[PDB]
Structure formats: structure tokens, C-alpha cells
């Protein structure tokens, strides 16, 4: 069936690696592990050996997006579908696969410009994870890391590629007027991916989302940011579609982190809807001075 | 056993009756009914014919606090216990009982100065209640109206009277330094009553609490206040003891209304604890310019 | 603890015995058994050998009301309480107890004039009951036969006697204006007994209630009455207090039978309420030509 | 509260010890352990070190009936109640208590003539019990060994003593005509004790009952008896009161063993009833040639 | 009812404070907090501000045992019972109560020589606890800290005092031959206290027990001890009575810590039993060279 | 769909047949039945007439591995897939099928050299199984006998054959460094088959696994081995992948038996992972003197 099961892992690029190394543990409550051999910050959020890398770079960027598949055959088969649509599929070397803490992966570049990695056999270590501060941990498992929201030059081209080629299913859309956002799922998590287009020629990422196991973690996280002078860009609130109670934290790279609890789950009787608003309540924009997103190209 | 079961109803006194008449429906989402014959605003929150009165008066005040008991015998018996401790017990006339929409009640005055009414056979009308705006209604039943927090001159005198005479059970205490608050229960609701003492000679009320059936009602209520220029005195947050996700709204009388969701319930294996803080997160004081409480006497 | 557990059985008196013999089976769906030696119609509704008698008499009357108690000691002890209040307690002979299909009973007369029988060890025959027509049977067990509603000259005298002496607990009251009805319980069944007073000097019964296991039995029963020319005095509807979906059937004796489904159950967190109406919906009076109740004395 | 909790253990006396030693294991599926020092057969049915003794004797007899109580104080207190009613209470020696595999016991003789032992701290050995043949084990725990049915000269004298003194509660009665049987409970097991009176001057026991965990064990047990020439005195069937699917096996002592599955459990809403029959179905008397009961005295 | 609810907290005395400070966090997985003003190590295991103290001293000793009660009245009332039996009851000063992180406590000395503290209103801080290593935390709540096993000169004197005066209930006994151990409960936890007597004139403690939320924590804890050269005195195994899967760790004071998972819970249908063995399996004595217990007096 | 459902049965070859005959019953707790006509030991573990054979032979060997399929058509169809890949498929004679206590089977030889039997209609006898010692029996049903772990010359050749031809699904891998193990499933049991390669030219088996219904059976089994001088080669512990609490017992043939409780179950949302370790805790190698595996060829 060669389907993407979940988001497996994520690679960020930033000059502000030392600031992210602290941010991940002190604010988000991820577990620091040792750096890569090249000086990237590395984090865990569950039994996986590593789900997030922050690599040194000249600009802020999405280095790579890791997706989970059952095994080699499913990643190969999906690869073939992608290859037929244009992008070159490349099998990772054994030494490359191990750097990503996976049994293996095929990778390719989006028509848009983002690197995706079709992985399997993610390395796990049971009962060794502990958060960077006293919070109740994260909701992963079958729903994976969480989700990422990307900004694309051409919403139809991008939308068609993610659905028709990569095989994501439409969750719902927000059409308020300013923005039109497409939400995609590959499991019970309301979305593993979403896309918007601020305008032509623009590429970037708005946020990644982590789910915590308690609402008090979301509230505490906001208070931790107020205490340690980390920008909260969006007050605690609830989205119209995913129904998740969340805040947005501004990271040392301009990418934001949605810190959320209690998302509505995708069921077999799930019908996509259209919303004219982003939020039911809250999500007040607290820092509109800051850059609205993490822009890669203009 | 002559025990208080729940808080049945509440009587407020204010000059700002017309402002409260609107506030109750437009902000809190109570159902307006017709005024009393004397021009008091009257509200429902469930199947009870009336749980809140706002009577005209020269100053802001707690007119009366209605408590629920099984029947006449239980209210009489509790009455006798109270009478032995000092306060005069008076049986309401039939016409008085009907004004309160109850079968009957005995009333008395606290040593402190608050009027309490031991009632039974509250008038109810099934399947006729609808909120003042689209919210999911209130959690009452065996837990009653909610709770009230009073300010008293002498915390030991007050505490002893509520527990030893009126027969409330201690839930827990907050001792941060500024304040020491006692929480009392008579059912599964974390507290139906709480008391604090800002200083000697002072009497007043801080807030009443209403429980709603959804967290989105709490969030929406805040946004409604921002929209209609009603002061929110405390941001969405969670108390250390009751664990309820709530905001505080400043009413046309200086009394505040805690609008909350999902309180921890009192069980048979419940042990009282001491807390050094009021809130786990949130509950940021947004309007410290306003009067801190509803003061009756200095 | 000597408490009444449920209503065990019922004795009706009527000249129209042959009409009742048919009515019980053809309309209510009770099981006919053989007559007493004296020509009374006898019915079952569950595993009990006999719960209803219809004895020959000159007028319509309540012959006796059977109550259930754990054993001899509990009936004796309750007897002593009653005896102290005025009524003579008499132990039934063995041959009398057997006519009632019970191990034994003490009996007495109400101050009002009704005969009550404190019984125990009711005769049962498992897996031999089948209804008089294809309906889903009756809800009895711990809730017993059902309930009876009596009319009394003096509501306070009657009320005080049933609660303070016989040890019934108040369920709720209806005070519309025309009538004031008291509802009493001794188990999970909303009420086993209720009383009203049309005026001074009047004694009678309005109805007995049977609970069926399906709503379709209530609906079918109405249609059976329309088919066989039996008066339905009250259309399908729902009471404000007991919340039961029911119709009232006019019996060959002027006593009515409430045929109902899905009554709200008395819990340990049960507070009595006051209602200003009898019904939430339905219960339209279809035959106000007929006598309003079964009057015994004027 | 000094109540009997369950039947703990049982002592039988018979000349046919070797026949019982085999019978217990091969037919009933009890676990043989080593004999007492004096040559009694000893069996387990659960984690208890020993629940049944078969002692050598000249005639068939009930040697002793062990009852379970919480501790020494409860057995002493019940002892005092018994002592006041006539029977001498004797504390067992340490060496006697150990022979019974209990921490200690007080014993006394019934007015009727049966020895009862009020015990506590029964010796148990976890996870070492295995049946004498492949059956699904026995239902004990809070319901204990099972029950015994005794025959008494004077049913009122016996009944009064078991209920008013030993503190058993009436479960129900069977009054067919031939026999009148009283059933008593001290826990969820429908009965732990029952009594009947064939005539004056007669004392004996009819049967003991063991509960198995599967109906197939009851059926298999019958077929085992047919195979090994052990008399089945009553075919598989179901009692009117206890509702248990059971057969009766004739033991090497004339005492019968009811081998049963799926008894109706005593609840807090349990009302005693009267039955005119012993069985709903089955329980066909297969061997009326054999002695009807185990008679001790005439 | 003035009953002890649970074990609240514990005070150990040892010269080896620095070794315990590390041991508590690195081996047991408790959370270190700041020392007392006098240099005692302090630990949390749940939301309580502090449940364990390790005070400096010349010898190894049990400094004090904290018990939980509902409030002041219950501790006072139990106090009065104790006072009548001999020991002096002393109310703690406010400053003393705060050192113990409780609202208040009465204390007294056992006839044996152990200090017990009847406390209430334990200080708690929600959602701030994190273990000293990645384990799944501890099972406390209504079952409290866990349990302690003391060694006493005179088992009857001690037993009588704990049950008849302090109001503990007997759980069960182990009588193998070498030892006779009494187990006492005051809640669902199989035991909060147990006592044994190696011989006359001897007083001490064998172990305290902590319950963890996963079996893997017990297994990991053993492997942590093997890694860091901490003596495991008893291999993973299961007790006959409490059924808990546990190991024993030898602490820097000679007191052992039972590290256990999945204890059988005390129910309302709980009967005390007698066992002839301590363990079903495991609990192999790995270090019989070490002192068998923590002896205070000879 | 022609899929393998479970492992049905197993055939071992050893010179030490008499030692295995005892070992199976006394240590593992299997039920002995009569030998084959040729003197093989035969065992049951559930309602199946026979799941394990130990045949006489000159060396230690895996005689045959029985797999379960729905019927003849599914075994034939899978046969055809296998036949196409190289191995000859042979239908068993009726007399051969009966020796295996199955309705019929096709058999073939692995490219590696192991004999596999595709069977159906396994002979069962309900309610006749009892363990060789007092343990709580085995978990089989839809998960079958358990699993076997084989050693192969060429891991890719073997892996490809089991997955692509026999139609097993990958469960997970352990890659520590010394070994790389592949785990395969065909049902809810974490694995029914696993393979490793010590080096080129080597063929053998490490262990078979039996699941018991209680953890105490695993613990008791270890203690039984210590008592009866049977080598335990691996202490109680928990694997990283299957999460089963188990010990390894060294059998009279060099094959080991994993005796385990409480394996994690394969779900529809199951993603294969990679582990860098075999065990979370325990599984200490107690007898490294013994041969590491059962080697068939070098
Ligand atoms: Fe998002
Ligand atoms: Fe409040
Ligand atoms: Fe009615
Ligand atoms: Fe019986
Ligand atoms: Fe212990
Ligand atoms: Fe294995």
C-alpha cells in the first residue's frame, strides 16, 4: 500500500545552534543528547533515539523532513510513484541512514524545494526518555513527531503534489481571506502537514507542532517563556479545525513551535470541512513586531 | 443527618441593576426571566426556576446565600445547632419562600454579618432553560450553583463557625504569604464556600464561581468581554487546589465571577492539602487598577 | 432498620369482576391465573405467584395494599412504630398469609381508612410468567409492583403519617394550583406512593402504575384500547418529576392504570424538588366526561 | 461487628476413609495432601493449606464445621453472644489450631449437637493448588468452601439459634409440602448453611456443595461417576432459589456432594422469597434405593 | 472517626548523609531538593513538598514516622486515645510543623521507643516533580509514601499497641519458623506498617518500601546498582502476602529499601491469612555478609 | 489469502529423549501423553492433542516446524508460491498427517535446510489438559505454540525467503554489534519466528519460546530449575522489542526454552523499529560455559 504512516523526524538549519540547544530543553522540554560529530544539537521526545536535529548553517532553513513507512518495500514503491512525477529518488548510504538513526531511507526534493526522507526502522531505546523540565511528556506513537506547516509559492502545484504523489489525504481548509491553508493527514493526528502561500516566489515554514499529555504543560510553558525572556507570539487558544489548546513559541530560528494539548483525532467517518476562521478563541497575536514566518526564498 | 447538600441560590445587591441585567445574559450566558415585583434582575442556569437575584440597593452587597437541604426536618435540625451557637433562626413566611422559588426556608445572620438561608424543595421547570449566548450550559445538579468566596474580619472565628456549626468540611488551604484562604465542601464540588481575611474590621466578597460544560465557553467568554468592553481581571489559568481552568470577570457590582471548566471532584478518599500558591499557570492579574474585592464594611 | 422495601401486591374491590378479569389480560398484559376460592380475579406480572387481586364487592374500593419487608422482625418492628402512633397491628393467620401468597404479614388500617399489609417471603415461581399479549413484560424486582396514588381528606395528617410513622421518604411535590401532590419513595422507583386531596371529607384512589420494559408497549397498549373500546383517559406523555413516558387507561373499576416506560431512578444524591406542572408534554385529558377518580367516601 | 464471613473448612467422620481418600481426588477433583498424624484424608480446593478432613470413625458424622472471622476479637465477641445463649465457648490450644491450619479458633456445640469452630488466619499457600483431574478449579475466596445442609429435630429451635445467636441472615425458604428448608447466608454465596427436619428426634446432614468454575466440570463429573461406578443420586438440574446448575454425587460416607456452577449472588437489594418447588428443571432422583440422607441420631 | 489514612513522610538519621543524598536520587530515583537549614538531605516522590529527610547523627536510626490524618480534630482525638494508653501527646510549634512541610502535627513516642507524628494538611506543589533518573514515578496518593518494617523487643506488646491504640488493622502474618511478622494496613496499600522480633531487647528497622509504576523500574534499579556498586541484598521476587514484584537495596544507612511494583490491594471483602513462607519466588539473599537489619538498641 | 496463521506444532530430534520426557513435564509444565509407536516423547500445552514431539536421533536437531493455515486450499496456494521459488512441495499421506495430529499437511525444505509443514485442522480435545506442575497454563489460541529462533548461514537469503515467499511480516530488528536479529510475525504474537547468523556455514536454533499466563510461573520455573539441577542460562528479564518478562532454560538437547509472560501484541498500527540492545533489564548470562546455541552444521 506504500503509505506514509507518520512524521518520523525533523532537521532544522540555523546559525543560532547554541541558543536552540538550550531552547529545546529549557522551553520545549525535549531531552538533550550528545551533538552529532559536526556540532548539531540533538533531541528526543519519546523512545526514538533522535527525532530533531539543529544543524549549523548560514541561514534559517528546513534541512529535511523525515517520514515513517513500514519498511524498505513501501518506501521504494512510494519512491517509484514520486520518481514518475519528476523528483530523483536516492537511497541513503548505510552511514547516512545511521546519522538519521533509521534502518534506511530514500530521499528526494519537492518541486517546491523541500527535502523529504522516506524512512523505516527508526532506532528506539525504551524507558530512557525524561523531559528537559517537569512536564508530562509528548503524545507520539502512531501519530509521530507532530506536524509542520510550510509556505509555498504556488498552492495548487504544492497541494496536487502532496496529495496525488506523496499520498497525503485532505483534512480541511481555512479560508478567512488573508490566508488559505490546506491541512493533510496520514493517521489519527488531525494533520501531519499543512501549506499556505503568503504570495508568489515565497518559500518558508511557519511552525512545527508538538503535542503534550497535559493542558498544564501548555500553560506552564507560556509562564516559563515569560520568566526566561522567550517570545510567546500567540496566547493560549484553540484552532477551529484541530480543536487543540495551544500557544505558539518563537524559536531562536524564526520557526515557531505550537505547544498543544488534546487534538481532535481523524476517524474512518471523517469528512473534510471549510472554516472561515483559524481559532475558536485565544491565539491572540502578542508579538506582531517579529517576522511573521521563517522565509527561505523571496 | 441535617447536612447542607449544595449552594441553591444567591442574592446580590447593587445600584447597577440594569448593567447586571445585561451582564448576566450577554457575558455569563445566564437566562433572563421576568424581574421580581420590586425590579430585581432574575436569572436561571439550569432547570431551577431562579438561582440568582440582583436586587436594587445603595451599595454593593451579598443580600443572601441559599443552601440546599433534603427537607424541612434537616433544615430545622441544622437550625437548632446554629441557634445553640448564637444566631436567631427564623422560618420564612409562605410568601417569602415563594419569592425565593423554594418550598420553604429558615434564615439567620452569620456572626460575621452574612445572611444564610437553609432551603428545600427548590422550584424547577424541566427542559425550558437556554443560555444567553451559544455556550454549552452549566454544571450544577448535586454540586449546585457553584461557590462563593467571602472576606471576613476574623478568620478563626469565621472558620470555626462554618465548620463546627454549619457543618462544612475543610477541602484545603492556600498559604502563600499575602493571603491564607480556607476552602470548604459539602459535596463533590471542590468547594461551595471559601474565606479569606485581608485585614481586621474588613468584610466583603471576592467572587462567585460558575462551572461551564466546555473549555471553549471559558475562552469564548474572555473574547466576548474584550469585544464588549467588560473587564477581565484575571487571564485564563488553573488553580493549584481545584485544578479548574478559569478566568475572572469583573461584574457591574464589584464582585467578580470565576468562569471555569473541569474542577477536580471531592472523593471519599479525599485528604486536605496545603498549597503555597494559588495557580499552577495563568491567572495573570490584568486589571490591578480596579478594586481588589467587593468591600461591604471597613 | 425495619424499612418498607417495595410495594409487594395489591387488592382491588369492584362489582365488575368479570370485566376486570378480561381487562387485566387483554389490555394490561398481565397473566391470568385461577380465581380465589371466592371468585376473585388473580394476576401475575413477574415471578411472584400473585401480585393483584380483584375481589367482588358492592362498590369500587382499595381492599388492601401489600408492602415488602425483609422478614418477620422488620415487619414486627415497623408494626411497633405504627402501633405507638394509634393503629392496631394484627398478625395474619397462616391460612390468611397463604391467600396473599406470602410467608406472613401484619396488617393495620390507616388513620385515613386504607388497609396496609406489612408482608415478607412473597411466593415466587421462576420462569413461568408470560404476558396476556405480546409485550416485553414489566419492570419490578427491587422496585416492586409499581405505585398507587391515593386521595385523602387531610393532606398534612396523611403526609405526616406516611413519612413519620410508615417511614416513606419525600420524592417531590407538584403545586400547580388545582392540586398539591406528595410523592414518596422507599427504593429506586421514583415513587411507590403519592397522595392528593381534592377537598375535605373525600377519600379515594386516582391510579396505580405499571412499568413496562419497552416504549412500544405503551404505544401498542393505547392502540389496543382504541381497537377494543377501552377508554384512554390521558394521551401518551411525560411527567415533570418521574419523567416516565406513559398513558392512563380507565379500568372497569373507576381506578385508572398508568402504563409507563423509563422512569427516572432515585439515587443517593437525590434532592426533592417542587414542580408547578404535572407533565412536560402529552398527557392530554381525552375523557373528562368520566369520573375524575375512584371515590370511596364523600 | 463480629460476623461470620464464610465457611472456612469442614471435618467429616467415616469408617470408609480409604474410599473417601480416592473419592475426593478422582471424582470431586480436590487435591490430596499428606494424611494427619492419625490417618485422616486431607484435601485442598484453593490456596488454603487444608479445607476438608475425613477422620476415621465408627459411624458417619459431621466432625466439625469451620467458619471464617476477621480475627481473634470478632470470634471472641461472637463467642460471648453464643455463650450467653447457652453453649460453652472453648479456645483451641495452639497445637489444635495448627491441626486445623488456622491461627486460632474458639469452638462450641450447637443446641442441636453439631460442633462449630469460629476460626481466623487460615493458612494459605499461593500458586500450589492443582485439581485431582483436569477441571477448571473451584469458586471460593470471599464465598469460602461452599455450603452444608443439616437435618435437625426441631426447625424453629435450630432456625432461631442460627439467625439470632450465630448471626446468619435468611436467604429464602422452600415449602413444597414434604419438606420445609431454610437457607442462610453470610456473604454473596446464596447460602453457606441450610436446615431441614425430616421428623422429630432426627439429626443428620444431606449434602455439602462445591462450586466449580465451568459448567463442563459438572457434566464431566457426572460422566466420570458413570465410568467409575460412583452413584449419581440426582441428575444435572437447577434449583429454584440458588439457580445453580448442579448434580448430586453419593459419597463413601452417606453425605452427598452437590457439584454446581453459576449460583445467583446475594446483593444489598436482596429480598427473601418463598418457593413451592426445589428445582426449575432436572435434579431427577436417580438412586432412591440409597439412604435419603446421612443420619447421625434417630 | 480519627483514623490514620496513610504514611505521610519519614525521617531517617545517619552519619552517612552525603552518601544518602546521592543514593536517594541516583538509585531510588527520588527528586533532591535543597537541604534543611541544618544540612539534612531532602527528597520528593510525588506532589508533596517533602516526604523523606535524612538528618545527620552519630548512629543509624528512625528519627520519626509521619502519619496522615484528615485534620486537627482527628489527630487530636487519636492523640487522646494514645494519651490514655500512656505516651505523652505534644502539639508541634508552627515553626516545627513547617520544617515537616505540614499544617500541623501532634507527636509521641512508642512504648517501644519510635517517634510517631500525627500530621495533616501536607504541603504539596502540583506538576513540579521529576525523578532522579528516567523511571515512571511512584504510586502514592491515598496509599501514601509506602510502608516501614520495624523490629521490636516484645511482639505482643508492640502488636497490641499498634492495633488497639493507634488503630491499625491486621493484614496477615508470616510464620515460617525463624520469624513471625505482623502486617498492618490503614488503606488499600497491603500494609503501611509491619513488625518482627529477632529476639528480646532488640529494636531496629529492616526496610522501607517504595512502589514504582512499572516493573521495568524494578529491573532497571537492580541493574543500576550492579553498575554503580550499590549492594542489592535480595534479588527480584514476589512476596506471599503483598504479591509485589520487588528487590531490596542496601542503603548508606543499614536500612534497606524494597523497590516494588504491583501490590495486591486491600478490599472491603479482605480476610487476613497466615503464610508459612515470605516469598512465592525470587528474593534470593545475595549479600548475607552485610548486617541483617538496622539495629538501634541491643 | 493463503497466509500462515500461527505456529501449530514442533518436532525436536535428540539422543536425550528420556531426559526431555521428564524435562517437558517437570520443568516446563507440559502434559505428557503416550509416546509415538517409535518411542518419541509427546506433549500438550493446550486443547491441541499434541504440539511437541521429541524424536530419537544421533544428534540434536529441529526435525520439523508445523505452521497453521485455514484449510487445504490456503496451504496448497502458499505451497504453489513456495514451489515457484525452488523447494519441492509434498502432500503428506493420511497416515503421516495423523502422526502429526492434523487433518493434512504439505511439507518442504528451506533453502537453508529446515523442514516446514503447512498444516490445517489440528486435532483438539477440549477440557482435558492439565500442566505437569501447578502453573497457570499457556497462552496459545490465535497466537499458537509460541516462536522459534533459528541460526542461518546467510541472513539476507534467509530473510528474503521467509518474508517474500513464506509471507511473514517484519516485526523489528536488534542491531547491537555482535548480532543482528530479524523478528517476523503472522499474528498478534510479537514474533512467531526470528533468525540470526553467528557466521558463514553455520546452521542451528537458539531457543523456542512458551508463554505462560502468570509472571509467578516464570519465577517459580527458575526456582524449580535451581531445586532440580537444571541449568538456567539467563536470569529473569525483559526484551527491548517483545517486552516479555522471561528466563531461558537449557534443555537436554542444547536448544533453550524462553519461559515468558506478558508479550506486547502486534496491532494494525504497528511500525517496525530498530533496537541497539536485546534487553531492557535482567537476562544476565548465568551459564556462558554451556554451548551458546544448538548447532546442526558448521
Ligand atoms: Fe499547527
Ligand atoms: Fe473560586
Ligand atoms: Fe403515577
Ligand atoms: Fe445445596
Ligand atoms: Fe515490605
Ligand atoms: Fe525469543
Author numbering:
A (entry chain A), B (entry chain A), C (entry chain A), D (entry chain A), E (entry chain A), F (entry chain A): -1 to 296
The paper states:
We successfully isolated novel 2,3-dihydroxybiphenyl 1,2-dioxygenase (BphC-SD3) and catechol 2,3-dioxygenase (C23O-RW1). Among them, catechol dioxygenases are well studied in the bacterial world. They are iron-containing dioxygenases that oxidise catechol or its derivatives and play a central role in the degradation of benzoate and its derivatives. Interestingly, BphC-SD3 retained its activity even for months when stored at 4°C. This was an exciting observation as most of the extradiol dioxygenases (EDOs) reported earlier are highly susceptible to oxygen inactivation.
The crystal structure of BphC-SD3 was determined at 2.6-Å resolution, revealing a two-domain architecture, i.e., N-terminal and C-terminal domains, with the sequential arrangement of βαβββ in each domain, characteristic of Fe-dependent class II type I extradiol dioxygenases. The monomer is composed of topologically similar domains, i.e., an N-terminal domain (residues Met1 to Thr138) and a C-terminal domain (Gly139 to Asn296), including a 12-residue-long C-terminal tail. Apart from two classical βαβββ motifs in each N- and C-terminal domain, BphC-SD3 has three extra β-strands (β17 to β19) in the extended C-terminal tail. Two layers of tetragonally arranged subunits are rotated ∼45° relative to each other. The octamer is a compact globular molecule having a central pore with maximum and minimum diameters of 43 Å and 19 Å, respectively. There is a 12-residue extension present at the C terminus of BphC-SD3 which adopts the β-sheet conformation. This C-terminal β-strand is present at the opening of the active site and is not involved in any intersubunit interactions. Unlike BphC, BphC-SD3 is active in the presence of oxygen, and the iron Fe(III) center is tetradentate pyramidal, with a His145 axial ligand and three basal ligands (His205, Glu256, and a water molecule). The requirement of Ca2+ or Fe3+ probably explains the oxygen insensitivity of BphC-SD3.
